[PDB]
mmCIF file of C-alpha atoms and ligand atoms in Angstrom:
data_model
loop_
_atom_site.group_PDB
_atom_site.id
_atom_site.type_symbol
_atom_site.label_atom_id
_atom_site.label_comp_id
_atom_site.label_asym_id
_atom_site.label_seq_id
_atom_site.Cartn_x
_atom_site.Cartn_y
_atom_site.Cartn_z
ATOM 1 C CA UNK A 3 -151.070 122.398 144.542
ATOM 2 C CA UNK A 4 -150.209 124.200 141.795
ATOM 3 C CA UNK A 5 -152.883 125.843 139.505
ATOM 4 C CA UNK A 6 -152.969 127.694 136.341
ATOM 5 C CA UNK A 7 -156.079 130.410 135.432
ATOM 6 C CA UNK A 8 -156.764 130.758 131.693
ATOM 7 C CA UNK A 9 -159.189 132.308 129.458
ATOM 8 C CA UNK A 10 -159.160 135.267 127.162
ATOM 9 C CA UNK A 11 -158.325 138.764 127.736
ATOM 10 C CA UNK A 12 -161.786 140.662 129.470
ATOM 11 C CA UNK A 13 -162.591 136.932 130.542
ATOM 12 C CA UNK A 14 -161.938 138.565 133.906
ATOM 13 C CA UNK A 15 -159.206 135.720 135.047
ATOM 14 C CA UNK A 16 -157.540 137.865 137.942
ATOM 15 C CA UNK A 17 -161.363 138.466 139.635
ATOM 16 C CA UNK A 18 -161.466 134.110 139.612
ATOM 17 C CA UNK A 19 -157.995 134.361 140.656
ATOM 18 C CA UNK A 20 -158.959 136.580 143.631
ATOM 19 C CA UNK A 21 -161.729 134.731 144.771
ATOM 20 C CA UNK A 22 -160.396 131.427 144.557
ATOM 21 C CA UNK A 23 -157.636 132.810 146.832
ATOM 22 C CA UNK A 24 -160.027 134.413 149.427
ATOM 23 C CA UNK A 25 -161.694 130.686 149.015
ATOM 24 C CA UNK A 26 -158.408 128.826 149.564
ATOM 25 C CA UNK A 27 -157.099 130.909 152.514
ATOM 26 C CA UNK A 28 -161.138 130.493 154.170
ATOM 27 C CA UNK A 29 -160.109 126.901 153.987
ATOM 28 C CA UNK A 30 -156.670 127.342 155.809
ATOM 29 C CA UNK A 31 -154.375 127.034 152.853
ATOM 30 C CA UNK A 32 -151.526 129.949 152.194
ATOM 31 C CA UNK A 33 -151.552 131.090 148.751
ATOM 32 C CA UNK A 34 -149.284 132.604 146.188
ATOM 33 C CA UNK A 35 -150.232 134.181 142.951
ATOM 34 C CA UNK A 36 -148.224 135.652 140.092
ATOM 35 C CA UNK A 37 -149.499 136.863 136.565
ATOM 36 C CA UNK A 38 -147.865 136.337 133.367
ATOM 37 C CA UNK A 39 -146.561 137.959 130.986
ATOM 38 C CA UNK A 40 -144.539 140.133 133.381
ATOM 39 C CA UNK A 41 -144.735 143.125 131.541
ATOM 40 C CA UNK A 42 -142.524 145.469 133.664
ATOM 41 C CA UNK A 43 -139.775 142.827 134.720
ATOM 42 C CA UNK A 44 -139.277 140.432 131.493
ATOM 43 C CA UNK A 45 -137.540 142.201 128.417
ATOM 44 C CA UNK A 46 -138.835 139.553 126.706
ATOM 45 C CA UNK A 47 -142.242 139.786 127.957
ATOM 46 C CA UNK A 48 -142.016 143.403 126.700
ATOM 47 C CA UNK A 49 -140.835 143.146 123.189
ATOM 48 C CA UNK A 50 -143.575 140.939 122.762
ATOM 49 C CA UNK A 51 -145.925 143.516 123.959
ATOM 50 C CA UNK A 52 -144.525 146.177 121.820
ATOM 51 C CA UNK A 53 -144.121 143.539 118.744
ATOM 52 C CA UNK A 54 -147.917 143.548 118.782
ATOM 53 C CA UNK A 55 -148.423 147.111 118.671
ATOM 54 C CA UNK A 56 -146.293 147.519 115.526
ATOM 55 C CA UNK A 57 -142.961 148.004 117.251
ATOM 56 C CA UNK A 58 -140.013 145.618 116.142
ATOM 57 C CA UNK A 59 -140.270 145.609 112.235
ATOM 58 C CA UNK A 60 -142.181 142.328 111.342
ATOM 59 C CA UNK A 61 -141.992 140.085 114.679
ATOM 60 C CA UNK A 62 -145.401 139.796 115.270
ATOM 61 C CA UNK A 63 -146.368 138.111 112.101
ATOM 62 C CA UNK A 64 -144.350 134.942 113.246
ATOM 63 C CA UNK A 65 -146.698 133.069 115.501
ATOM 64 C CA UNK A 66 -143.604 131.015 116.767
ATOM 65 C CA UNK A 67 -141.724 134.193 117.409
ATOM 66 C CA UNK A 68 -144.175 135.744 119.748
ATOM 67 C CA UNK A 69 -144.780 132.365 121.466
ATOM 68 C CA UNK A 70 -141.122 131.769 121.929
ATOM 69 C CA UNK A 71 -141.074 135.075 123.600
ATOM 70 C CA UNK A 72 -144.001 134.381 126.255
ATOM 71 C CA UNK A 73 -142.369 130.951 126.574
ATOM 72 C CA UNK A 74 -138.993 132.507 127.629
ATOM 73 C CA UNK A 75 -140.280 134.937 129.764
ATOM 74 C CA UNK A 76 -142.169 131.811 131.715
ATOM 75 C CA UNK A 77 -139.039 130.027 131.696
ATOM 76 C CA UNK A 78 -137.128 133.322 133.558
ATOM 77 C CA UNK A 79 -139.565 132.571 136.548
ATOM 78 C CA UNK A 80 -139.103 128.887 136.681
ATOM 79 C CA UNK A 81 -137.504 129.267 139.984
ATOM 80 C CA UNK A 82 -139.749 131.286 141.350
ATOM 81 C CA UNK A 83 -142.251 129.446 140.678
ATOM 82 C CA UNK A 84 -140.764 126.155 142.267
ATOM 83 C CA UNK A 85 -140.020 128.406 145.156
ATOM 84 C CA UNK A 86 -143.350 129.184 145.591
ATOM 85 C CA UNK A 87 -144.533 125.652 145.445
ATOM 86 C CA UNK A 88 -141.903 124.413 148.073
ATOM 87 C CA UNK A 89 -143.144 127.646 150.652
ATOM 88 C CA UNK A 90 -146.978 127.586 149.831
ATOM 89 C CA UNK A 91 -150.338 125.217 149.962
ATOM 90 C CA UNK A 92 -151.207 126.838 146.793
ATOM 91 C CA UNK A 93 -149.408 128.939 143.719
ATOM 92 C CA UNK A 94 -151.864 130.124 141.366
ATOM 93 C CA UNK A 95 -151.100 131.419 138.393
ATOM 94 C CA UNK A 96 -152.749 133.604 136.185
ATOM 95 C CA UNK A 97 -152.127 132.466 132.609
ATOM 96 C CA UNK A 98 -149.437 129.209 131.817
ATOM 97 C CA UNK A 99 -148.057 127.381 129.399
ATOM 98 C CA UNK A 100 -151.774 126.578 128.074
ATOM 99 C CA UNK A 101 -151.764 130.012 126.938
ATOM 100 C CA UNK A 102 -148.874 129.763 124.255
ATOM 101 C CA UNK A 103 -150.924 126.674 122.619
ATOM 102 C CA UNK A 104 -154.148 128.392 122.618
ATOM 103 C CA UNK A 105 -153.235 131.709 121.008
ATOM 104 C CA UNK A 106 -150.710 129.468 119.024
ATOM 105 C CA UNK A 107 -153.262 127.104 117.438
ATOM 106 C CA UNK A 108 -155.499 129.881 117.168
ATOM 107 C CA UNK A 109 -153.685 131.895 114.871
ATOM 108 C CA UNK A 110 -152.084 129.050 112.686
ATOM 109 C CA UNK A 111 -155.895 127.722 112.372
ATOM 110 C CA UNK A 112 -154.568 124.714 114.229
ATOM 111 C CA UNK A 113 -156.563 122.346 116.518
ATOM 112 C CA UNK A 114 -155.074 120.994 120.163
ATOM 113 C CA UNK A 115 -153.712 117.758 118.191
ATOM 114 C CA UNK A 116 -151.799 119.956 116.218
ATOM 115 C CA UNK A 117 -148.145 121.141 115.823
ATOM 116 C CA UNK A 118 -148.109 124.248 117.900
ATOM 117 C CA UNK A 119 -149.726 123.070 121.197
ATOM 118 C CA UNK A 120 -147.419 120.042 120.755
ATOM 119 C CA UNK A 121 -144.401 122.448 120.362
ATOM 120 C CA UNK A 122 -145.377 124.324 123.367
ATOM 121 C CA UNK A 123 -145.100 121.036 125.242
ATOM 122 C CA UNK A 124 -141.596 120.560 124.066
ATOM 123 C CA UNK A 125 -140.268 123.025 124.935
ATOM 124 C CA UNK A 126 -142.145 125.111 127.596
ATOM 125 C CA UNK A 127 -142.295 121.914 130.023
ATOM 126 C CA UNK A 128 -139.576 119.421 128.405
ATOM 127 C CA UNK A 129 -137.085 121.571 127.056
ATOM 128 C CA UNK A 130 -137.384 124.803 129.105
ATOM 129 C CA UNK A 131 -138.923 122.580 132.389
ATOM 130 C CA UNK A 132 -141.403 124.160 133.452
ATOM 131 C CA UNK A 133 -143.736 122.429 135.863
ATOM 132 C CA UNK A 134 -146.773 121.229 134.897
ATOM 133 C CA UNK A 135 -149.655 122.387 136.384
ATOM 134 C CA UNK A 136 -151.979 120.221 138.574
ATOM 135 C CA UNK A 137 -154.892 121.758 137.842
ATOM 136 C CA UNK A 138 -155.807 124.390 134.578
ATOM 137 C CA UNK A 139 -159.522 125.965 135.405
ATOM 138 C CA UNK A 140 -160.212 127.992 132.251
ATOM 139 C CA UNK A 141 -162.562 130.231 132.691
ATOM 140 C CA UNK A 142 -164.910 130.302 129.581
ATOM 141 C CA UNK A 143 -167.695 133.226 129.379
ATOM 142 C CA UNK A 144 -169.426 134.777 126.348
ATOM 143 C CA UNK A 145 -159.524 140.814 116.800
ATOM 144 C CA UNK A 146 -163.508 138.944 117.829
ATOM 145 C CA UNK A 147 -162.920 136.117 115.682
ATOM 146 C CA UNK A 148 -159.471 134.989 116.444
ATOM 147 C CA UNK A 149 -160.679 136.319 120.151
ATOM 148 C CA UNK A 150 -163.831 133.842 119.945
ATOM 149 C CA UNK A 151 -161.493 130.933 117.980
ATOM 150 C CA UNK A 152 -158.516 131.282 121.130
ATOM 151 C CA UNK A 153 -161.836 130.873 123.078
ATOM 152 C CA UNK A 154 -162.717 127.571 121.397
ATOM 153 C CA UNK A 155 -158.657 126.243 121.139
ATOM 154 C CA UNK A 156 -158.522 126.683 125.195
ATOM 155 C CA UNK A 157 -161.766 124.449 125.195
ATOM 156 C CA UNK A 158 -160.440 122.073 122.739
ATOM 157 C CA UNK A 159 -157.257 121.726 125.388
ATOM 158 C CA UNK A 160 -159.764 121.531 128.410
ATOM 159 C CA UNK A 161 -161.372 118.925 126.687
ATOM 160 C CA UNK A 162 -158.415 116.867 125.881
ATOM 161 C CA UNK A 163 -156.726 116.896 129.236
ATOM 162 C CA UNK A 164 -153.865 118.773 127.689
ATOM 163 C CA UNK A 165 -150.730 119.631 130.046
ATOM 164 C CA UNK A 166 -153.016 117.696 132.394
ATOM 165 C CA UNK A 167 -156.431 117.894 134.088
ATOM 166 C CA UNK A 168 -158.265 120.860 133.748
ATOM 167 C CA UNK A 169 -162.129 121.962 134.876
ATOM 168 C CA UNK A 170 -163.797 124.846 132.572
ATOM 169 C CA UNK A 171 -165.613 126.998 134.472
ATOM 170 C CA UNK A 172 -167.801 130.128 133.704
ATOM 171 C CA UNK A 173 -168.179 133.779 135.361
ATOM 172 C CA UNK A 174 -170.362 132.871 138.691
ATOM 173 C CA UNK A 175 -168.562 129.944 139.748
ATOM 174 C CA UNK A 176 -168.755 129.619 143.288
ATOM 175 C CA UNK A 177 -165.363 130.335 145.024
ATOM 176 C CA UNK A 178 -165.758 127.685 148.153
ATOM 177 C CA UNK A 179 -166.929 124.564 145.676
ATOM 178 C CA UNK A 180 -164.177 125.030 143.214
ATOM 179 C CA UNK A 181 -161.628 125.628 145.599
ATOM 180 C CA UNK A 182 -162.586 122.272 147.465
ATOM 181 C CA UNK A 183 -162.222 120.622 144.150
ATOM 182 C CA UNK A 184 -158.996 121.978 143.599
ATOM 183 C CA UNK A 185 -157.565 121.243 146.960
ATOM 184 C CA UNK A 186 -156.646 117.547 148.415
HETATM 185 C C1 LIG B 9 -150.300 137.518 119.441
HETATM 186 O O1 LIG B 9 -149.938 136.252 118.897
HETATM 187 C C2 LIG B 9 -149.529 135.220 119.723
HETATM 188 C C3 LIG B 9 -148.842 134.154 119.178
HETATM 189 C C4 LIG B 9 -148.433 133.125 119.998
HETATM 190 C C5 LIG B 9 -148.687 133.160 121.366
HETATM 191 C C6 LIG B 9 -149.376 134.228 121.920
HETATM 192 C C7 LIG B 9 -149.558 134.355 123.376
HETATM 193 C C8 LIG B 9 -150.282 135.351 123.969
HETATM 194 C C9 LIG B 9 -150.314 135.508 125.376
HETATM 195 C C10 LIG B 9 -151.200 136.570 125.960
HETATM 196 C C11 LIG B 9 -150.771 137.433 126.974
HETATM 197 C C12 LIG B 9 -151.630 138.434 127.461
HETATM 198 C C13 LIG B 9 -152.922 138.585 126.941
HETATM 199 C C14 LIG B 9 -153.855 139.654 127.422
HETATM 200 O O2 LIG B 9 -153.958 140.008 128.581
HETATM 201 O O3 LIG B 9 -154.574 140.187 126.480
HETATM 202 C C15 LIG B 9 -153.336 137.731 125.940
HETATM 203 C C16 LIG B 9 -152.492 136.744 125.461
HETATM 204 C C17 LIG B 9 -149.570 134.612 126.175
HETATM 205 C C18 LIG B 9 -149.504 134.705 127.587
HETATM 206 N N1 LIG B 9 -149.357 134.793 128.716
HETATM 207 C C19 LIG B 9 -148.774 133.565 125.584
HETATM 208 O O4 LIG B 9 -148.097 132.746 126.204
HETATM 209 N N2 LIG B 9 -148.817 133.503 124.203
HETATM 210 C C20 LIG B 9 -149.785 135.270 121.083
#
């Protein structure tokens, strides 16, 4: 099973990832875990980083140009990440391609039926072919407004099943139970 972790940044996705990993390996299961963006290891990953803290002349005021960045650095571990599905129980990942369409939609004032999140689609998992994720737990907990309106986009997905099922979840989630939902 493959399983992505979303949220917003202080949401405090790697603790959930953590514990759902302690959780899954108390059942019996080996996991795998990787974080995106992989600041460090994807040039692309970086200039996107740097675009939004004024580096690289005007990049960052093109939503599609930052989003076509975190997309292509996801698409540069593709094969990792199919590795780690053919060796493992369980590969979770700490933010997906539910990411781009939340921080997309967010910042074109866009809704989940909208343009971006359906772009993401296209090419993150169609064109690019990515896998899609068997289960995306966001992990929902109280720039603030565009912070609080990415917030309400990932719900929006959550809500619409988008990229597939999801389960929103909030900061005392018990490990064990959601981990049993998440497994076969
Ligand atoms: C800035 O404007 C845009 C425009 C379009 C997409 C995105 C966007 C953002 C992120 C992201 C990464 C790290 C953190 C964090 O830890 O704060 C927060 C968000 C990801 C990811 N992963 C992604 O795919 N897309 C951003």
């Amino acid at each position: 099973v493959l399983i992505a972790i979303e949220g917003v940044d202080g949401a405090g996705k790697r603790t959930l990832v953590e514990k759902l990993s302690g959780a899954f390996r108390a059942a019996g299961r080996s996991v795998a875990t990787l974080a995106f963006p992989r600041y460090g290891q994807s040039v692309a990953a970086d200039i996107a980083a740097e675009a939004l803290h004024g580096e690289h002349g005007d990049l960052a005021s093109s939503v599609y140009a930052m989003a076509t960045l975190f997309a292509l650095d996801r698409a540069g571990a593709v094969h990792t990440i199919q590795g780690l599905c053919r060796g493992y129980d369980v590969v979770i990942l700490d933010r997906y391609v539910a990411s781009n369409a939340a921080y997309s939609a967010a910042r074109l004032h866009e809704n989940a039926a909208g343009k971006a999140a359906a772009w993401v689609q296209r090419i993150e998992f169609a064109r690019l072919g990515l896998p899609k994720p068997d289960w995306q737990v966001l992990l929902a907990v109280s720039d603030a407004e565009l912070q609080q309106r990415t917030g309400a986009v990932y719900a929006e997905l959550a809500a619409q099943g988008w990229g597939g099922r999801w389960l929103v979840v909030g900061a005392d989630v018990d490990p064990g139970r959601l981990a049993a939902t998440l497994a076969p």
